[PDB]
Amino acid sequence: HWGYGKHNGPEHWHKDFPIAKGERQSPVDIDTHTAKYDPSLKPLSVSYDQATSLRILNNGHAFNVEFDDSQDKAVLKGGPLDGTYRLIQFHFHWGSLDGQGSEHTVDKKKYAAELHLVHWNTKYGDFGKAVQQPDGLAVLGIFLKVGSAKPGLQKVVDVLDSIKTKGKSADFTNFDPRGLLPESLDYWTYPGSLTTPPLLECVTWIVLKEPISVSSEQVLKFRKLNFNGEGEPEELMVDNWRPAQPLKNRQIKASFK
Ligand SMILES: NS(=O)(=O)c1c(F)c(F)c(S(=O)(=O)CCO)c(N[C@H](c2ccccc2)[C@@H](O)c2ccccc2)c1F
Ligand SMILES: [Zn+2]
């Protein structure tokens, strides 16, 4: 039922998922002056050299690229994390215009889009068990601004015409997610939640300070996707972001300054 429109969007999600009004909901505005530099935070370790992508799917909310996570390959650790987290999928959130689209904001600034690389804690054995845990997931968030093209994105962009509508999927092998990272791994971190139903409070968020640049043409291709299925009226997949939620009790920590 849920989606991103007037009658089913963010302001409605609490009826099916009352945690929507919980104490550790995401995204949030990152007030960069209030974030605490934490000298005890470790550099983030991103090891994606053996990542194995499997498919790409239009799920009617966004598109996912899912990875084979049955071996110890693409892993996030260090930073604020205890233990090892395995990459399972990435997706994006983006706007109808370049001035909105991100879920997190930085001093109220919205970016054109936001990339989420979703990892589960290997101590829980699989992602379905990990989402039931308060430290089950680590999501790496990367802002996108419009400027110069991101060459590492173009393989994604060029397959989107094959998954235009809800339910469509394709083969999507040998995609290297290292091509979506910025130069710097400096980050903010805080405890939060999934930003889509079921909104589980299971995520350690790690948001990189440095955005990647993508071209205007690359993001225009995201905006040609459809929310609807094949043979329903066409509704462009745009503005699939949840707005910032109350920070409540929480402290955002910075790895830098
Ligand atoms: N922004 S976010 O990172 O919070 C987020 C999304 F915004 C998002 F769009 C997805 S999605 O799979 O692309 C479509 C909505 O379910 C998921 N996918 C969930 C997921 C995938 C892999 C491992 C854990 C969670 C979703 O598929 C899910 C939710 C709850 C329980 C199992 C799986 C997601 F986690
Ligand atoms: Zn997301």
91 marked as binding residue: yes
Report which DSSP code applies to 244: P
Nearest CA to ligand 1 atom 23: 127
Whether 61 is catalytic is yes
Mutational test site, ligand 1, from 17, 89, 140, max ligand atoms within 8 Å of CB: 89
User: CB of 160 closer than 6 A to ligand 1?
Assistant: no
Q: Please state, in angstroms and as integers, the Cα–Cα distance from residue 207 to each residue in 125, 161, 199, following that order.
A: 25, 29, 18
Q: How many residues does the chain have?
A: 257
Residue 64 burial (CB < 10 Å; 0-12/13-18/19+)? buried
Breaks in the chain (C–N beyond 2.5 Å) sit after none
Residue 102, Cα to own-chain centre: how many angstroms? 9
Please give the helix or strand (H or E) that residue 92 lies within, else none: strand 85-94
Q: Residues with Cβ < 8 Å from 105, sequence gap 6 or more?
A: 27, 28, 29, 30, 111, 244
Straight-line distance from the first to the last Cα atom of the chain, in angstroms, rounded to the nearest whole number: 44
Enclosing H/E stretch for 106: strand 105-106
Determine phi and psi for 154, rounding to 5 degrees.
Answer: -65, -30
In 3D, which of 179, 192, 166 has the Cα closest to residue 250? 192
Is residue 101 a contact partner of residue 111, using CB atoms and an 8 Å limit?
A: yes
Atom 10, ligand 1: residue with shortest CA distance: 196
Please tell me the distance between residue 199's alpha carbon and the centre of ligand 1 in angstroms. 9
Question: What would the two tokens of residue 165 be?
Answer: 């509508």
Which of 118, 124, 225, when mutated, tests ligand 1's pocket best, judged by the most ligand atoms within 8 Å of its CB?
118
Contact 235, 225 (CB under 8 A): no
Specify the CATH number for the domain of residue 145.
3.10.200.10
Tokens of 143: 């802002």
Helix then strand then coil, % of the chain, to nearest 5:
15, 30, 55
User: Torsion-angle region of residue 185: left (phi > 0), alpha (psi -120 to 50) or beta?
Assistant: alpha
Which of helix, strand or coil describes residue 219?
Answer: helix
Tell me: is residue 93 an annotated ligand-binding position.
Answer: yes
Contact 244, 104 (CB under 8 A): yes
Query: Quick check: CB of 102 below 6 Å from ligand 1?
Result: no
Closest residue CA from atom 17 of ligand 1: 196
Number of domains in the chain: 1
Range of the domain at 215: 1-257
Distances (CA, A) of 124 to 53, 80, 85, 174: 22, 18, 10, 27
Distance (Å, whole) CA 249 – CA 257: 23
